[PDB]
């Protein structure tokens, strides 16, 4: 119990680490140095050499939806909707720095599979938005959701 308290403390301390925190609210061009311009325009997948903390590395079991997403991305490539390099550039770079680290790995793969359908006009955004509504309605009406939820 004492030890768990110690470890919770050490975790909490870190959130109070002092910093000079400058919120950015669309600064004028005179506030952007070449250094800043290179950093804002970086592709965020390029992390090698950045400093980071120790972690106990873990395995993770795969969600049904993650396996399905992986297969969807590869089948879209098999059938010529995109190449994997097109996927990597949309999924690991175009998503931008915030979503790149805030959302989970296969979250990004899945958002980017939706994205290719709309960007190449295989579906309209209206069709995607309408289909999400349909899926939520299938669920609420007790009709089930594929392998995720029985009727």
């Amino acid at each position: 119990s004492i030890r768990e308290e110690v470890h919770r403390h050490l975790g909490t301390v870190a959130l109070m680490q002092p910093a000079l925190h400058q919120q950015t609210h669309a600064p004028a061009p005179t506030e952007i140095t070449h250094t800043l311009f290179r950093a804002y325009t970086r592709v965020p997948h390029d992390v090698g050499g950045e400093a980071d903390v120790p972690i106990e590395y873990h395995e993770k079991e795969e969600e049904i939806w993650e396996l399905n997403t992986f297969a969807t991305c590869e089948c879209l490539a098999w059938r010529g909707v995109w190449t994997a390099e097109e996927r990597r550039r949309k999924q690991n770079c175009d998503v931008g720095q915030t979503v790149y680290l805030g959302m989970p790995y296969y979250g990004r793969w899945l958002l980017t599979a939706a994205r290719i359908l709309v960007d190449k006009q295989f579906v309209t955004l209206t069709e995607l938005h309408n289909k999400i509504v349909e899926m939520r309605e299938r669920v609420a009406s007790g009709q089930g959701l594929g392998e995720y939820l029985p009727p």
């Binding site: 106990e56 795969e62 049904i64 089948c75 669920v139």
Partner: protein, 217 residues
């Protein structure tokens, strides 16, 4: 209670099929193929190489040709018949020696040799491994319980284009007269990534925490 990801997965998959981009049979076929995969073929390639100098030469020079001997044809094994779209068709095999030890990452994402090795580990996809291994590889490898002499060249291989790698470790002491099967058994997934070395008696990856899924495969 389905999550937002489950809702959007079903939406995407139904739209793609409705619009004739891929079929439900395509998707089943791909998932069926993925379920076949695992690290045994790659362990077998290393065992065969430890037993046949000519085949070890082929592994080091032409990993794609060498993979055929353990049943993984990087072109024709996958359902596309043109290699998988994400892992391509250029396997290279990295040979450790008494003065060289390799370990692999994809700092840009998670590129990994799925056709011959199976699923990439969670931690391999992590930003944390992707940041640190390239720049502090002795520190990271020590966390996995591996240290080498300071004069041994540790080489980190960063899989940033179309090549995928497996590590062929040195054959360990205490394996005189072993058969291909006994040898392959100690070449674990972690040995093939390079964060572990094969040891007689050790036939599974070192146990570590497993993060559970809300709803599993």
């Amino acid at each position: 209670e389905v999550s937002d990801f489950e809702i959007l997965e079903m939406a995407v998959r139904e739209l793609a099929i409705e619009k004739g981009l891929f079929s439900a049979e395509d998707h089943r076929v791909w998932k069926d193929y993925v379920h076949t995969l695992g690290p045994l073929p790659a362990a077998r390639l290393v065992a065969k190489a430890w037993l046949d100098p000519e085949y070890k030469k082929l592994c080091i020079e032409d990993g794609v040709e060498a993979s055929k001997a353990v049943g993984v044809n990087w072109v024709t094994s996958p359902p596309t018949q043109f290699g998988t779209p994400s892992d391509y068709c250029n396997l290279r095999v990295l040979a450790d020696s008494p003065t060289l030890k390799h370990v692999v990452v994809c700092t840009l994402c998670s590129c990994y040799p799925w056709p011959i090795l199976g699923q990439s580990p969670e931690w391999y996809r992590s930003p944390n491994y992707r940041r640190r291994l390239v720049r502090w590889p002795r520190q990271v490898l020590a966390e996995f319980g591996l240290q080498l002499p300071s004069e041994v060249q540790i080489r980190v291989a960063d899989s940033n284009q179309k090549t995928r790698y497996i590590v062929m470790p040195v054959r360990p002491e205490g394996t005189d007269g072993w058969t291909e099967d006994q040898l392959a058994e100690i070449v674990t997934r972690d040995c093939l990534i390079g964060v572990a070395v094969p040891k007689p008696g050790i036939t599974v990856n070192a146990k570590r925490p497993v993060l559970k899924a809300n709803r599993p495969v």
